[PDB]
Design a binder for this molecule. Structure first.
Ligand SMILES: O=c1ccn([C@H]2C[C@H](O)[C@@H](COP(=O)(O)NP(=O)(O)O)O2)c(=O)[nH]1
Ligand SMILES: O=c1ccn([C@H]2C[C@H](O)[C@@H](COP(=O)(O)NP(=O)(O)O)O2)c(=O)[nH]1
Ligand SMILES: [Ca+2]
Ligand SMILES: [Ca+2]
Ligand SMILES: [Ca+2]
Ligand SMILES: [Ca+2]
Ligand code: NA
Ligand code: NA
Lengths: 217, 218
């Protein structure tokens, strides 16, 4: 990913973290981000049929893998703001052995606070798998804000409260967007705005509580 | 500090259970499999604390669940140590920040394949927290057997019943047993057998499908 796009992602990330807490930088510490990456990596690992004692014919939940890698990126962008890849990542990740090893290595890197390296690993993973990480990031960033608006912090929102996990709606919201659309330096901000409005529409956010791309960048 | 006789019998139960899962599990499994399993249980354990600063921030620790997850880690650290054949823990674990640091260190230890040291950590945690780890082990061991015979591998097992997960039924099963009851070197087997039968009663296992302590030890 280009330096411009990475910067814009990090700026979105700062903004989201601020919605969660003003003064997040004084409230948080690098070990919080390591723990967060660890827990998402566990969710990612749990998308594979790694259990030899349970549901042994299960297939990998490749749709969920996309969400979990996107969540890791939120937290590694965060950790980096408060602070070789071939030694850790093994391709192709469609091979379950490669995934389990590569994604357990994300936990070791998170524990060492190697956040920029985690970010590169996520980007490398999305490129190998062949999904649009940028588009997923913007979609899930928008959902993270909607969660905070609906009282996630206070316990008045839970992610499966309309009977379907909120994350699952994100695939449809990003379906029209190519890699080039969301990374083209002269037009990306409009595509990021389109993604935001598709997610707001998916969750019926009132027009008045919506934020445009210009609010974040 | 558990006695060598109790430690060995826990390990024999565990080998027993691993063999129900697969004959020749030692040839099928690798040390890294046990490392992964422990990592995943420790994530369950960390998630029993209110660590998330963005979600339901006034929540309290699920300290009953903590007991189950430590017990799960023990199954896997006993297994790891068999497969391979301080500065890590911060007490008290009643403090969230202590638990979060300690249990992330368990993940690192699991990754380093220091399985006997994970086992010691779990034993020390249970002493610190003050619950009967040996009784919980025998109880979950029984439920683990029940799962295997009620379709866990094939995907037909039903884990949650009207809101309540199988694991939650174990607490009532272990209530009547002290530490001395389940560790007395002359008598413990009979008490382990009583725990097994309470778990079977809780899950309504038909008598013909029950085992006794003697099907596992001797
Ligand atoms: O300070 C924070 C806290 C949370 N998140 C976001 C990142 C991630 O996308 C989401 C994870 O939320 P969750 O409550 O663990 N639920 P799920 O993993 O299903 O999205 O939280 C942030 O971006 N910054
Ligand atoms: O070869 C194995 C595989 C699994 N387990 C047991 C240990 C642990 O107690 C349980 C974990 O089962 P799970 O399917 O992860 N579910 P839960 O964590 O809710 O018990 O599986 C073993 O003892 N040996
Ligand atoms: Ca999560
Ligand atoms: Ca997630
Ligand atoms: Ca588990
Ligand atoms: Ca567990
Ligand atoms: Na998840
Ligand atoms: Na659990």
């Amino acid at each position: 990913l280009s330096p411009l796009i990475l910067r814009s992602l990090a700026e979105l990330q700062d903004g989201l973290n601020t919605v969660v807490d003003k003064n997040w930088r004084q409230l948080r510490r690098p070990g919080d981000w390591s723990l967060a990456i660890t827990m998402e990596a566990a969710e990612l690992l749990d998308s594979y049929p790694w259990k030899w004692w349970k549901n042994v014919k299960a297939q990998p939940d490749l749709q969920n893998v996309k969400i979990e890698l996107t969540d890791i990126l939120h937290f590694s962008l965060s950790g980096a703001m408060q602070v070789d890849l071939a030694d850790f990542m093994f391709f192709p990740l469609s091979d379950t052995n490669n995934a389990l090893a590569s994604f357990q290595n994300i936990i070791r890197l998170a524990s060492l606070q190697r956040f920029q390296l985690v970010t590169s690993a996520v980007i490398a993973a999305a490129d190998d798998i062949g999904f649009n990480l940028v588009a997923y990031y913007v979609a899930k960033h928008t959902l993270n804000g909607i969660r905070q608006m609906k009282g996630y912090k206070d316990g008045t929102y839970v992610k499966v409260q309309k009977g379907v996990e909120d994350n699952e709606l994100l695939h449809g919201c990003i379906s029209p967007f190519s890699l080039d659309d969301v990374t083209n330096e002269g037009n990306y901000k409009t595509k990021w705005d389109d993604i935001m409005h598709r997610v707001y529409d998916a969750f019926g956010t009132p027009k008045e509580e919506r934020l445009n791309i210009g609010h974040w960048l």
